[PDB]
Design a protein around this ligand. Structure first.
Ligand SMILES: NCCCNCCCCCC(=O)NO
Ligand SMILES: [K+]
Ligand SMILES: [K+]
Ligand SMILES: [Zn+2]
Length: 617
């Protein structure tokens, strides 16, 4: 399988700049590239990525998305002086030209195609290209918004032609609307374009009516263009995550893309002069991580905007951190989206209701049963202290007097050993332990974590019984996926009873993206505890996405030995790729009704669940 992450960059693309007075473009400086690459080198991230050289995009590759007349007009700019370059740039909106910009434009485009090839050739698992000029505003016969050629549009068309892909997802989290990408794939159902952008009721640049939520695509591409307009500035982490959980992610996993291309503009981060939003650079580590379970991890990150030189480097490294599989930082202070964001999210979901189902040294430690030996990935390891042995003795005599099964005692010693290495040693991140007795193992795992201390523990249990888990003090949230419909009493437990059949994968994924993840992210646990009983596919996507919480510190307790299940949890816990879910039969209405009743029951306490504007009394 593929491994590593590509970092495509070249200092040549920082060798064009603005040569005349223009306050509209004076923020697009060469230092954007040099600051971002040097930030990756300072933090040791560039040295960890496979450096792929940039090449020039050929003429025929440029003609994939641009006209011959516009290409030949740009081709003449290297021969122009300052006066002629100023006159040529006046023919367009918010863009300047340079003697070298046509050279770097072909390099920025070629760098994107180099990144597409390395990912599609399985030479790397994912990658990022630091390019200038940007591209998502560029159109078929016009330069626009600092862009000359549409790099991301090139990547999708290049991937369609040379690899025969049928479904490509484009995620534009830049703060500006990439109308060039929208125009290019307006009638193409093979490319799904998502974009959030500062809109302010069309008053913000580029002031386009097509940037609104009602532009869903044209013809056979209807429903494959998703615009989410930000009508107020200061959007926070809660707004960005609500946009993912309730708009992008449900559509993305139903779309099931064969490749993910990200128009990664970081002017959506706090401190940027263009965006004026308030999301921290840490949010981009999660925006990346939440998309990695798609397309078997094949993700191509292309740089677009980002103009606060300090805010830029921080978010670039947070993106590469997630691409390399590093633990995601904890996000605190999460809550409901603001009213403006909730109105936007509500409107996009309604207009897309007719096109999509959901609307209207060691990273992992494994302890198999005694004697079972299995092949482990490179970053995983098998399992005992004398202090742990004494503590298991102390736990036994106080809480389990009539208990002598010396193999049950073995697992409890491993649970303490694994948890001690996860929280305190900082050398182990997560782990998986095969378990015989559930009630004693869950009790030991949960109680030992609270005194570690883990101030908050999220428990995700796939079973039917009741477990020794107290959820009455705010330190524990219980997520239970069961077979028997249980009346949920209190606002700190989430019980999902899915009506059995061939619709469980679709219903579970909708509950994962729409209920579990929004609640888990607001809860901000210090450790995740996964529990699966013997009587109890989709667990790989759950294990990977849930690692966005608690810095990826998850302990999974598997009851009984299933090598297939064991091998999948360990693979997902270790950071390996997750095989894509195929086409899923749309969820049963009885499950959607059940999931919406739980949202009504919990969204007043966990505002991140809200996908509507609350009714004021
Ligand atoms: N604050 C006033 C609005 C001026 N807007 C200038 C357009 C440049 C677009 C660059 C970009 O980041 N594209 O993604
Ligand atoms: K955007
Ligand atoms: K589209
Ligand atoms: Zn931008």
């Amino acid at each position: 399988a593929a491994s590593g992450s590509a970092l495509i960059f070249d200092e040549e693309m920082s060798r064009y700049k603005l040569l005349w007075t223009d306050p509209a473009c004076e923020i697009e400086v060469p230092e954007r590239l040099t600051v971002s690459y040097e930030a990756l080198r300072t933090h040791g991230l560039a040295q960890r990525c496979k450096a792929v050289p940039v090449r020039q995009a050929t003429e025929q590759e440029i003609l994939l998305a641009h006209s011959e007349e516009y290409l030949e007009a740009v081709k003449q700019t290297p021969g122009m002086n300052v006066e002629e370059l100023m006159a040529f740039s006046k023919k367009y909106n918010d863009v300047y030209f340079h003697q070298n910009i046509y050279h770097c434009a072909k390099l920025a485009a070629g760098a994107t195609l180099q990144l597409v090839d390395s990912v599609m050739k399985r030479e790397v698992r994912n990658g990022m290209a630091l390019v200038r000029p940007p591209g998502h505003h560029s159109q078929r016969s016009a330069a626009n918004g600092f862009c000359v050629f549409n790099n991301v549009a090139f990547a999708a068309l290049y991937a369609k032609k040379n690899y025969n892909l049928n479904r490509i997802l484009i995620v534009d989290w830049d703060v500006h609307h990439g109308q060039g990408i929208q125009y290019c794939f307006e009638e193409d159902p093979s490319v799904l374009y998502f974009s959030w952008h500062r809109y302010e009721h069309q008053s913000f640049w580029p002031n386009l009516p097509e940037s609104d939520y009602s532009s869903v695509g044209k013809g056979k591409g209807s429903g494959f263009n998703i615009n989410l307009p930000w009508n107020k500035v200061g959007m926070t982490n809660s707004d960005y995550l609500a946009a993912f959980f309730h708009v992008l992610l449900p559509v993305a996993y139903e779309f099931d893309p064969e490749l993910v291309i990200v128009s990664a503009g970081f002017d959506s981060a706090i401190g940027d002069p263009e965006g004026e939003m308030c999301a921290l650079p840490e949010i981009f580590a999660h925006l990346t991580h939440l998309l990695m379970p798609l397309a078997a991890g094949k993700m191509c990150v292309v740089l677009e905007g980002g103009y606060n030189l300090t805010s830029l480097g921080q978010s670039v490294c947070q993106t590469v951190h997630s691409l390399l599989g590093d633990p995601t930082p904890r996000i605190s202070g999460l809550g409901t989206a603001c009213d403006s964001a909730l109105e936007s999210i509500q409107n996009v979901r309604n207009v897309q209701s007719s096109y999509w189902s959901s609307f209207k040294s060691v990273r992992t430690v494994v302890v198999p049963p005694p004697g079972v030996e299995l092949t482990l990935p490179k970053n995983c390891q098998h399992s005992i202290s004398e202090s742990t042995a004494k503590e298991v003795q102390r736990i036994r005599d106080k809480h389990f007097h009539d208990l002598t099964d010396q193999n049950i005692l073995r697992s409890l010693g491993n649970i303490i050993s694994v948890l001690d290495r996860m929280m305190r040693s900082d050398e182990v991140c997560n782990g998986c332990v095969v378990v015989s007795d559930l009630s004693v193992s869950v009790q030991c795992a949960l109680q030992h974590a609270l005194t570690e201390p883990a101030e908050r523990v999220l428990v995700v249990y796939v079973g039917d019984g009741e477990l020794p888990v107290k959820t009455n003090d705010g330190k524990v949230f219980l997520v239970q996926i069961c077979t028997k419909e249980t009346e949920d009493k209190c606002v700190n437990r989430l019980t999902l009873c899915l009506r059995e059949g061939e619709s469980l994968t679709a219903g579970f994924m909708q509950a994962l993206l729409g209920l579990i993840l929004p609640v888990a992210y607001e809860f901000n646990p210090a450790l995740v505890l996964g529990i699966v009983e013997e009587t109890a596919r989709v667990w790989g996507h759950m294990t990977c996405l849930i690692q966005g919480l608690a810095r990826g510190r998850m302990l999974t307790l598997l009851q009984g030995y299933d090598k297939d299940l064991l091998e999948l949890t360990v693979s997902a816990l270790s950071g390996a790729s997750i095989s894509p879910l195929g086409p899923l039969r749309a969820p049963k209405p009885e499950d959607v009704e059940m999931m919406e009743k739980q949202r009504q029951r919990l969204q007043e306490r966990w505002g991140l669940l809200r996908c509507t504007v609350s009714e004021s009394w």
